[PDB]
Design a protein around this ligand. Structure first.
Ligand code: HEM
Length: 207
């Protein structure tokens, strides 16, 4: 099934992400809320782009049931950032890191090409990760740095009750997508690239 092949083909990349110096240090308590806020600022940039691509692909009629708007993170992230930074001044201060420029550019290509299989790869890499492991990240930000849960809205998924069920249903939708061999290969390759972009975001944050 596609859900298994996605997980298997990116498992090593996921381990690599876990072991990133920046993200590792953040989750171990060695950094602080400032660095967490820098991460979330970069995330706002790439989630904004991702959600434009999701919107385009949803409108095309591809993977509709998968592309649940309840998953949208950009607006929630903006509210988190208003809290983390104390005002909305971050909007004019923030700049996309080189990593984020590449990631956003790719997302804009997917949006404008209305490339459904590529979009689904990106959707899986970000949202299933958020749904599945986000609670661990949120917990660590609360534990090590005292971040208020009200500033961790990104991790909450308002609108979803039974999360396990939601995850299982998400995987079933992946498995039920109609894809050619070319589309499936493209989707798998793109998921790998999605991990690569996300790792580099961490690498750039560390610099
Ligand atoms: C580059 C950043 C990361 C990305 C893109 C990402 C992506 C993903 C994805 C796509 C899944 C779903 C796997 C599947 O069930 O098919 C996932 C699960 C998960 N993630 Fe991440 N993840 C990242 C970083 C992390 C970090 C740093 C942690 C450390 C807390 C973490 C903890 C988990 C956990 C616990 C799961 C549930 C199961 C599993 O362990 O593999 N993730 N992540």
């Amino acid at each position: 099934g596609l859900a298994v092949e996605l997980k298997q083909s990116t498992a090593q990349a996921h381990e690599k992400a876990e072991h990133s110096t920046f993200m590792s240090d953040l989750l171990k308590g060695r950094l602080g809320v400032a660095e967490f806020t820098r991460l979330q600022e970069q995330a706002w940039l790439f989630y904004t782009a991702l959600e434009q691509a999701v919107d385009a692909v949803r409108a095309s009629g591809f993977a509709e049931s998968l592309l649940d708007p309840a998953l949208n993170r950009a607006e929630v992230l903006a509210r988190d950032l208003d809290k983390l930074n104390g005002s909305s001044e971050w909007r004019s201060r923030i700049t996309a890191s080189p990593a984020v420029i590449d990631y956003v550019n790719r997302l804009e290509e997917i949006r404008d090409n209305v490339d459904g299989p590529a979009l689904v790869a990106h959707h899986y890499v970000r949202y299933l990760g958020d749904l599945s492991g986000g609670q661990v990240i949120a917990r660590m930000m609360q534990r090590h740095y005292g971040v208020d849960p009200e500033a961790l809205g990104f991790y909450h998924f308002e609108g979803i009750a039974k999360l396990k069920v939601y995850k299982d249903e998400y995987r079933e939708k992946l498995n039920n997508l109609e894809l050619s061999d070319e589309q499936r290969e493209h989707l798998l390759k793109e998921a790998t690239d999605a991990f690569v972009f996300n790792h580099q975001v961490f690498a750039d944050l560390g610099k």
